[PDB]
Amino acid sequence: ANSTNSQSDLDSIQAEITQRLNEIDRVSGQTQFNGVKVLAQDNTLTIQVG
């Protein structure tokens, strides 16, 4: 937001913002436990404890 930045600098910072987004999405997709994508959907997993 600083007025002490040129528009070229705005685009420059957009670059790193997009990189952060890309890495977040990559982790989301690629993380997995025993064939479960713990972040890929809205899920309920029941554990038999009786």
Add this chain to the structure above:
Amino acid sequence: ANDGETIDIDLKQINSQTLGLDTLNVQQKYKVSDTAATVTGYADTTIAL
């Protein structure tokens, strides 16, 4: 962890040309002057006598 889960690194050639500075010159043309040349004497050739 599986086939096709990589990260893409990109590389670009760098040189005077690809940076366009290969054509950089700072000189300025001198004023050209000269004088007629005295072509002296003779020189032997392969033309047999």
